[PDB]
Scaffold this active site. Structure first.
Site, short mmCIF file in Angstrom:
data_model
loop_
_atom_site.label_atom_id
_atom_site.label_comp_id
_atom_site.label_asym_id
_atom_site.label_seq_id
_atom_site.Cartn_x
_atom_site.Cartn_y
_atom_site.Cartn_z
N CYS A 47 57.96 93.49 119.21
CA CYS A 47 58.27 94.22 120.44
C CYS A 47 59.48 93.64 121.17
CB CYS A 47 57.05 94.24 121.35
SG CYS A 47 55.53 94.81 120.55
N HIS A 80 57.36 103.65 124.35
CA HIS A 80 57.63 102.30 123.85
C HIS A 80 58.26 102.39 122.47
CE1 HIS A 80 57.56 98.25 122.64
NE2 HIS A 80 56.27 98.06 122.43
N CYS A 105 55.35 91.53 125.69
CA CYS A 105 54.27 90.99 124.87
C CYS A 105 54.48 91.42 123.42
CB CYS A 105 52.91 91.46 125.37
SG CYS A 105 52.66 93.25 125.32
N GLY A 154 53.58 91.31 119.11
CA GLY A 154 52.56 91.19 118.08
C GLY A 154 52.65 89.87 117.36
C1 LIG Z 1 47.11 105.08 122.29
C2 LIG Z 1 47.39 105.95 121.06
C3 LIG Z 1 46.33 105.66 120.00
C4 LIG Z 1 47.29 107.42 121.45
O1 LIG Z 1 47.30 108.23 120.24
P1 LIG Z 1 47.25 109.82 120.36
O2 LIG Z 1 45.82 110.28 120.37
O3 LIG Z 1 48.18 110.38 119.34
O4 LIG Z 1 47.89 110.02 121.82
P2 LIG Z 1 47.99 111.25 122.85
O5 LIG Z 1 49.17 111.00 123.73
O6 LIG Z 1 47.92 112.53 122.08
O7 LIG Z 1 46.64 111.06 123.70
C5 LIG Z 1 45.41 111.71 123.30
C6 LIG Z 1 45.00 112.70 124.36
O8 LIG Z 1 45.15 112.06 125.66
C7 LIG Z 1 45.84 112.91 126.54
N1 LIG Z 1 46.57 112.10 127.50
C8 LIG Z 1 47.42 111.05 127.23
N2 LIG Z 1 47.95 110.53 128.31
C9 LIG Z 1 47.42 111.28 129.35
C10 LIG Z 1 47.59 111.22 130.75
N3 LIG Z 1 48.38 110.34 131.36
N4 LIG Z 1 46.91 112.12 131.50
C11 LIG Z 1 46.12 113.01 130.88
N5 LIG Z 1 45.89 113.16 129.58
C12 LIG Z 1 46.57 112.25 128.86
C13 LIG Z 1 46.75 113.74 125.64
O9 LIG Z 1 47.22 114.92 126.25
C14 LIG Z 1 45.85 113.98 124.42
O10 LIG Z 1 45.03 115.12 124.66
P3 LIG Z 1 44.52 115.72 123.25
O11 LIG Z 1 43.35 114.88 122.77
O12 LIG Z 1 44.12 117.16 123.53
O13 LIG Z 1 45.71 115.64 122.31
C15 LIG Z 1 48.78 105.60 120.51
O14 LIG Z 1 49.76 106.07 121.42
C16 LIG Z 1 48.95 104.10 120.32
O15 LIG Z 1 48.41 103.53 119.37
N6 LIG Z 1 49.71 103.46 121.20
C17 LIG Z 1 49.46 102.09 121.61
C18 LIG Z 1 50.51 101.13 121.10
C19 LIG Z 1 50.24 100.68 119.68
O16 LIG Z 1 49.13 100.82 119.17
N7 LIG Z 1 51.26 100.14 119.01
C20 LIG Z 1 52.63 100.12 119.51
C21 LIG Z 1 53.12 98.71 119.76
S1 LIG Z 1 52.24 97.91 121.12
#
Ligand SMILES: CC(C)(COP(=O)(O)OP(=O)(O)OC[C@H]1O[C@@H](n2cnc3c(N)ncnc32)[C@H](O)[C@@H]1OP(=O)(O)O)[C@@H](O)C(=O)NCCC(=O)NCCS
Ligand SMILES: CC(C)(COP(=O)(O)OP(=O)(O)OC[C@H]1O[C@@H](n2cnc3c(N)ncnc32)[C@H](O)[C@@H]1OP(=O)(O)O)[C@@H](O)C(=O)NCCC(=O)NCCS
Ligand SMILES: CC(C)(COP(=O)(O)OP(=O)(O)OC[C@H]1O[C@@H](n2cnc3c(N)ncnc32)[C@H](O)[C@@H]1OP(=O)(O)O)[C@@H](O)C(=O)NCCC(=O)NCCS
Ligand SMILES: CC(C)(COP(=O)(O)OP(=O)(O)OC[C@H]1O[C@@H](n2cnc3c(N)ncnc32)[C@H](O)[C@@H]1OP(=O)(O)O)[C@@H](O)C(=O)NCCC(=O)NCCS
Ligand SMILES: Nc1ncnc2c1ncn2[C@@H]1O[C@H](COP(=O)(O)OP(=O)(O)O)[C@@H](O)[C@H]1O
Lengths: 729, 402, 402
Positions: free
Chosen positions: B91, B358, B388, B390
């Site tokens: 990161c 990110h 932060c 990994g």
């Molecule tokens: C967290 C993570 C698993 C989310 O994956 P995802 O399910 O594809 O993400 P989404 O943005 O579609 O979020 C899922 C749901 O939450 C909802 N949502 C996300 N942020 C929201 C918010 N602020 N307010 C309301 N709803 C929200 C989305 O609209 C979506 O709805 P859906 O289920 O109908 O699609 C993924 O972004 C992730 O792994 N990130 C963390 C970072 C990481 O692991 N590695 C990067 C290096 S640190």
């Protein structure tokens, strides 16, 4: 490059050569030095000569058939040789498995069909030989087993077993069952999963069916005859290689899942098998095989392999050969059995007795309770009819042998009694007196007792000779040990009759001389008492359970201390105190006793009350009790985790030594298997007795390094960890 | 020795992962566009005095392989002497590039360096490059490899952050990022992406959900409960953290950093380099530091890295006007704020990765240029940027306005 | 301000591509083996003062992906604060890692750094990472992508180097490499590779063919004449070098660098870092320089880079005792020698990549440590290390004995 162990400067011949008129060569393995074929120095030289001859006469040979002239096909590596390999012998071990696999690789790439004639068991190196063949035919005879059980002895399939099974099935399929578990399969199941291609009815059909397959193979596909799938240019590994995006997405979870299954225990064999499997799948077959040899040499030269080879081969065979059985006594078949008490112990004895094919009479203080004990056997057969393991016709003939009763008159004709009532000597005296005269004369009178000495329980009956201790373990349907206890007036003939009964129900027996606590209950008490002491000392309860699991135990101690009733543990603490104060001595209480009484004061005495160290809702553990931290001020003591682990392992290993000094046990084998199969001592230790001679830590390895750590533990946590005088010098 | 100065610090809008606007844009094109924007701002710059182009990239494979920094130099028609090197510190890669560029200028052996990062996570997903720590069992078993998500859930468990606490930070990140866009804070540094015909492709951080409510964040499912169960990473973590009984999985897709595409570029040089080229300094690299913490809870890295850069610059927490910590997971920012007693009005004042995204390789350079603009808009002096990492790493940088 | 000193410089033996001894060895293991050798030489070394591990790797995918420098830190049990970053500047990645480490030490913000590189070309082949300069038609069409081999044959065509001329240099490299081994020059620097059981895997440079003869080199066939016809790379190069009518393909497998597996590690630190840990400095890094040349030839980078590093250090060719240029191709060394009139007895005195091999990411650190040892043996003062780089880049370094 050579097919031989030596290239400079006289073994026996174990292979018989026979080339027929068609060009097929039959290699018949018949080791004259034993009743089984193993990978000793004789087999290596014998197979070396045969493979050299197969290459020299390649122009006059059309196919090869590997067969055996014994009950079993091939039993694998010589455990008597492998258990002696020292770390300095890593070079010799590496060269031996490279030579063994150099022979199979030549056999595998002759350009001719090679068929394995698996007459009997082919286990470990035996199956590795068959896996080098292009086709495998197994006789569906009785007692035949096939598998790679090297991991159960602390090893890995180092003769191409890891490499070839991954080429055949892929990383995931090969590791899940045949490799990481070392499970043994019957020939019908071996053909299903793919370890075997054909089955025949009898062993005489093998070589003809093998030669017929060669003749058909040379005609149906002459180009692919004698060419394994991974030796073809368009080979695709099942499930993909570690570079395939599908497998690469799930591959990081394999070590963590394996870490979860082992609960962090120091068992290096499955870790090495997984490493050799994945690393081998990244390179060519030959390079993969060499990687497999290095991981095999790291295990064989290690200490865990020594412990597990000692316990699960040598100690287990000494037991199953009558080592505890005395002198010579004829067999007495058991016609009917009578179980006293329909509790979880008595109901478990009724299930394992009927599942072996015996008629059982389950008696209790009412028919309502005897039917709830037979319901313990019904609920198991209902779950066994869904998994497809038992048939409805057999499951009905099994439950038909269990007759739930409440009248003592139904014990007429019983020639084998197994009491499992409450832990009260007068009660056991009473329940045996009502039946001593109803049963047949020469009937064995057994008692499933936890601590009460059998000698004192025998006075409640008339024939003191037929009275014996037959200790079962909860739950009886799973636990495989029976602790046979010998009273002072117990005859050697009754000792053998229970020894034979334990082998009839498919369990492992140990023989123990009478004393309070016997061997299992006495040792497992030190294990749970050491954990309660850590809780009273203020150590976090989650760390105590983690230290118990990462030690190799099948159940964390506080969780086990809830299965065992804290009311029962307090009864034992009163007996040991009354016995010392009745002789004038000053009883020194174990630090755990203050924790046991405090928990009872709080009304949390175990799972039976639904409240103990854990919380129990709707019959399931709901995590540790949140108030446990405030009660004992948890977090005030933060000792090293390895200090907690050693305290639990050393408390049992030292008490096992006392049981050996006091004559409670007569053999270390009974101590090892008895601790492993009875009270769940971690298998990687080879037993609570092997843990002494096979201790390995920062201090070193050996009985000397065990005493040093024992004294180091005594100086920091209490003088109970002081080694007995027998361990010194 | 030689002071390093930030002369330009621009970035692209962050396009989302699913149906993102930048999914049709090759990562090389994102970097070239930022190079062309540097030329538009300085049409008379002698690019021959540019010694190196350092780009962070966490998945340097496929469209991001073969030294994308050198590809950026050659494709943009930059002088062939301008170098081009890709580095990967997970990161921190975006910030590690700027720090390395700054350290190169300080040694006096480099004069003017372009630093930044690029990451098109919709085209090259995280983990596409493989790795020994994850895809080699002997190492994965020796090291206690647990994904970043479980370490974030474990942080909230040990430190006592509730599901409502992490959704509370996710809310203010969305609000502050939306207020920054409304106030025009990002109009100068966010360079819109355009095609080869000049048509617009993206001009805003399309991952932002500015109408986020506290009720919508509570409806979301913990997105990391199936991973720790299907892989057993929960048990692996608790084997090292044995005093913890259970892991509270509080992190969802709404309180975690978003998967996005993006790129950033920072122009760093000496004082003489700016005078010869007419560049006006915007900030000065005061100090950089690299530290780390436990690898299982791999997101505790920024705490000792921040202390190390403060001690090296001879400063305290009160001397810093703005703190910028990447919002990889909400619990990571809460623990960092709790450890150093960071005033809430000084922490990620323009939102962060939970709202805007990110892009692994570019995030460090993006949030750095964010503080360059914010320090100037507020007319403040010092800011501290950290991420932060990994594997348990941590990188921190201190800039001062000029 | 502070000076950067080389306290240790070790390397692994290089294993062949076909039937290589190190093919069964993970690249991460090659690095961990060197880390443990450093521990063996300084058991009381406080590893907490090591602030970064910088490894070069040209193909950071598969076994070599996921920040292999961080994997080396965790798998070897090094302190988690020791960082770990992978970088890629093609062939100079090993030297660039050492240069970046030196610049970090001089900036004052790093004290003790491990630098080097790793490349298991038999496990991760060249080009496994991909890249836009080859796999993107738009970028490939613009940068006039031509493989390094065609540029090498083009250099021989332009400079009038015959097939006998390049084969003569190939013979010299084989002979001087053999004399160096038999003389015991490499005894302390080459660390034998062993397995988990202590068994030997490789202790010598397998690629060497010490019985090479002039007649044997003449029987070899041009290895890159088929790549030129199947791909039209010859016609692409002559479109830029229009005054050349035909490319004379003189480079074979006997006069080109070998594809091998290897890894090297160097310990760079400040004077205070060495005094604190009781380390004796072996050499001082005088100056580093990054330049480049045309990307179609892409192998003329050493000449402008060496010119720059000599100018910045206030030195001339006459002030340098030993010249070490990576023998990627024989014509590359012959051009560098003619351009700067390097005396023959000063150039690659202990043989090069033709005899011993060219592990892309590790070569720069291998030849760096070769000059550190030869300066101490000859009791000479200065040496200049340089490598030609893909994409037309160039990196040079001047070291001084201490
Ligand atoms: C967290 C993570 C698993 C989310 O994956 P995802 O399910 O594809 O993400 P989404 O943005 O579609 O979020 C899922 C749901 O939450 C909802 N949502 C996300 N942020 C929201 C918010 N602020 N307010 C309301 N709803 C929200 C989305 O609209 C979506 O709805 P859906 O289920 O109908 O699609 C993924 O972004 C992730 O792994 N990130 C963390 C970072 C990481 O692991 N590695 C990067 C290096 S640190
Ligand atoms: C072969 C087997 C399946 C059936 O054996 P059986 O026909 O019931 O015969 P026994 O168990 O009485 O053993 C008879 C002899 O074989 C020997 N033997 C069997 N397998 C052996 C092995 N792998 N190594 C050495 N000796 C072995 C026994 O030590 C015994 O020798 P002895 O009679 O002189 O004391 C059983 O012995 C077995 O489980 N073998 C273990 C195979 C294995 O797991 N190998 C792992 C390493 S590759
Ligand atoms: C998976 C496979 C073995 C069975 O598939 P199936 O017959 O459609 O369905 P099931 O798996 O439910 O068959 C039941 C048996 O599969 C076995 N099985 C399932 N997955 C297995 C695995 N990975 N390894 C070994 N056995 C496996 C079970 O032990 C079970 O035995 P049982 O019936 O005595 O309980 C089959 O698809 C196959 O032959 N090829 C897959 C690859 C392979 O050969 N794996 C075996 C490795 S030894
Ligand atoms: C030049 C190259 C194509 C050779 O590949 P190769 O054919 O696999 O090389 P080998 O050395 O295994 O084989 C070359 C042949 O000449 C022979 N040969 C090689 N060096 C020899 C020598 N010094 N004396 C005698 N014979 C020699 C080999 O034995 C072989 O003969 P064979 O074909 O009958 O087996 C390859 O090494 C290469 O591309 N290297 C250049 C590096 C590069 O392009 N990029 C890296 C960064 S600059
Ligand atoms: N080994 C341990 N055993 C029990 N509790 C611990 C342990 N380590 C940390 N803790 C708990 O965590 C708190 C802070 O510990 P800390 O030193 O920050 O852990 P770490 O260094 O692993 O982050 C302590 O107050 C203690 O209650």
């Amino acid at each position: 490059s050579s097919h031989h162990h030596h290239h400079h400067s006289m073994p026996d011949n174990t292979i018989q050569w026979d080339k027929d008129a068609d060009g097929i060569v039959t290699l018949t393995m018949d080791d004259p030095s034993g009743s089984t074929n193993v990978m000793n120095e004789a087999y290596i030289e014998s197979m070396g000569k045969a493979v050299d001859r197969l290459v020299a006469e390649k122009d006059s040979i059309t196919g090869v058939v590997v067969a055996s002239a014994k009950k079993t096909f091939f039993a694998g590596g010589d455990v008597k040789t492998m258990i002696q390999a020292r770390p300095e012998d890593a070079g010799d071990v590496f060269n031996t498995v490279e030579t063994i696999k150099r022979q199979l690789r030549t056999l595998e790439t002759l350009g001719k069909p090679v068929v394995a004639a698996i007459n009997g068991a082919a286990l470990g190196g035996g199956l590795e030989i068959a896996l080098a063949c292009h086709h495998r035919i197994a006789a569906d005879v009785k007692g035949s087993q096939l598998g790679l059980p090297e991991v159960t002895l602390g090893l890995l399939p180092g003769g191409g077993g890891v490499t070839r099974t991954v080429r055949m099935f892929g990383i995931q399929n090969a590791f899940v069952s045949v490799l990481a578990q070392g499970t043994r399969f019957k020939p019908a199941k071996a053909k299903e999963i793919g370890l075997v291609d054909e089955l025949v009815a009898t062993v005489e059909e093998l070589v003809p069916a093998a030669k017929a397959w060669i003749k058909e193979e040379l005609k149906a596909n002459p180009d692919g005859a004698g060419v394994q799938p991974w030796d073809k240019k368009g080979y695709k590994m099942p499930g993909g290689t570690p570079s395939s995006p599908g497998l690469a997405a799930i591959l990081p979870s394999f070590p963590s899942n394996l870490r979860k299954q082992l609960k962090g225990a120091p068992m290096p064999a499955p870790r090495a098998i997984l490493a050799a499997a994945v690393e081998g799948a990244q390179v060519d077959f030959d390079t993969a095989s060499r990687i497999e040899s290095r991981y095999f040499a790291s295990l064989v030269t290690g200490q865990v392999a020594k412990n597990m080879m000692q316990a699960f081969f040598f100690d287990l065979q000494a037991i199953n050969a009558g080592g505890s059985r005395p002198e010579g006594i004829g067999k007495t078949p058991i016609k009917r059995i009578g179980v006293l008490g329909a509790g979880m112990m008595g109901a478990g004895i009724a299930y394992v007795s009927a599942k072996a094919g015996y008629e059982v009479v389950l008696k209790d203080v009412s028919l309502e309770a005897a039917a709830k004990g037979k319901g313990y056997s019904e609920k198991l057969e209902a779950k066994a009819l869904e998994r497809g393991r038992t048939t409805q016709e057999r499951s009905d003939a099994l439950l038909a042998r269990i007759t739930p009763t409440a009248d003592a008159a139904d014990f007429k004709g019983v020639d084998f009694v197994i009491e499992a009532v409450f832990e009260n000597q007068e009660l056991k005296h009473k329940v045996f007196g009502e039946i001593e005269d109803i049963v047949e004369p020469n009937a064995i009178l057994g008692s499933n007792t936890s601590t009460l000495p059998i000698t004192g329980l025998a006075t409640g009956v008339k024939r003191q000779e037929d009275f014996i201790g037959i200790h079962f373990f909860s739950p009886v349907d799973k636990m495989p040990l029976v602790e046979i206890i010998k009273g002072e007036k117990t005859s050697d003939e009754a000792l053998a009759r229970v020894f034979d009964y334990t082998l009839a129900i498919g369990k492992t027996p140990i023989v123990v001389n009478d004393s309070r606590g016997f061997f299992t209950s006495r040792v497992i008490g030190t294990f749970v008492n050491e954990a309660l002491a850590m809780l009273g000392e203020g150590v976090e309860p989650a760390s105590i359970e983690q230290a118990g699991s990462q030690a190799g135990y099948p159940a964390p101690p506080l969780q086990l201390s809830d299965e065992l009733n804290l009311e029962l543990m307090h009864k034992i603490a009163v007996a040991t105190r009354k016995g010392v104060e009745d002789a004038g001595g000053t009883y020194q209480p174990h630090p755990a006793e203050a924790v046991v009484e405090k928990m009872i004061e709080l009304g949390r005495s175990g799972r039976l009350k639904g409240a103990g160290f854990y919380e129990y809702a709707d019959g399931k553990r709901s995590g540790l009790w949140p108030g446990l931290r405030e009660t004992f001020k948890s977090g005030s003591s933060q000792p090293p985790l390895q200090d907690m682990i050693d305290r639990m392992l050393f408390a049992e290993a030292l008490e096992t030594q006392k049981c050996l000094d006091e004559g409670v046990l007569t053999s270390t084998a009974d101590a090892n298997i008895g601790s492993i199969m009875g009270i769940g001592f971690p298998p990687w230790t080879g037993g609570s007795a092997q843990f002494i001679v096979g201790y390995s830590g920062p201090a070193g390895t050996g009985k000397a390094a065990f005493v040093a750590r024992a004294r180091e533990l005594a100086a920091a946590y209490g003088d109970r960890f002081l080694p007995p005088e027998s361990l010194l010098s | 020795s030689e002071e390093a100065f930030i002369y330009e610090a621009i970035r692209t809008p962050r396009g989302k992962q699913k149906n993102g606007s930048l999914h049709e844009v090759k990562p090389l094109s994102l970097v070239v566009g930022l190079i062309d924007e540097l030329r538009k701002r300085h049409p008379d710059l002698d690019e021959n005095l540019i010694s190196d182009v350092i780009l962070g990239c966490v998945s340097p494979v496929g469209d991001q392989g073969g030294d994308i920094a050198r590809a950026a130099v050659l494709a943009s028609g930059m002088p062939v002497t301008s170098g081009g090197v890709q580095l990967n510190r997970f990161c921190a890669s975006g910030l590690e590039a700027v720090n390395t560029a700054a350290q190169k200028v300080r040694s006096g052996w480099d004069d003017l360096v372009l630093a930044g990062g690029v990451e098109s996570m919709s085209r090259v997903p995280m983990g596409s490059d493989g790795g020994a720590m994850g895809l080699d069992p002997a190492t994965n078993y020796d090291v206690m490899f647990v994904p970043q998500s479980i370490g974030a859930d474990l942080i909230a468990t040990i430190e006592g952050f509730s599901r409502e606490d992490v959704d509370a930070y996710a809310l203010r990140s969305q609000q502050k990022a939306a207020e920054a866009w409304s106030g025009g804070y990002f109009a100068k540094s966010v360079v819109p992406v355009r095609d080869q015909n000049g048509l617009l492709i993206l001009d805003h951080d399309e991952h932002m959900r500015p109408d986020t409510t506290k009720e919508g964040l509570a409806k979301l499912k913990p997105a990391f409960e199936g991973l720790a169960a299907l892989g057993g990473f929960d048990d692996v973590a608790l084997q090292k953290y044995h005093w913890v009984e259970k892991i509270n999985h509080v992190h969802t897709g709404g309180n975690s950093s978003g998967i996005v595409d993006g790129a950033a570029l920072v122009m760093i040089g000496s004082a003489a380099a700016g005078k010869l080229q007419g560049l006006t300094p915007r900030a000065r690299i005061v100090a950089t530091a690299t530290s780390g913490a436990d690898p299982v809870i791999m997101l505790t890295g920024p705490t000792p890295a921040t202390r190390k850069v403060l001690d090296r610059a001879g400063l305290t927490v009160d001397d810093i006007d703005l703190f910028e910590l990447n919002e990889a997971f909400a619990s990571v920012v809460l623990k960092f704020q709790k450890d150093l007693n960071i005033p809430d009005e000084k922490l990620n004042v323009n939102g962060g990765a939970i709202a805007m995204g990110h892009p692994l390789g570019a995030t460090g350079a993006m949030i750095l240029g964010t503080m360059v603009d914010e320090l100037e808009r507020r007319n403040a002096r010092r800011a501290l940027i950290t991420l932060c990492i990994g594997g348990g790493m941590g990188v921190a940088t201190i800039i001062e306005r000029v």
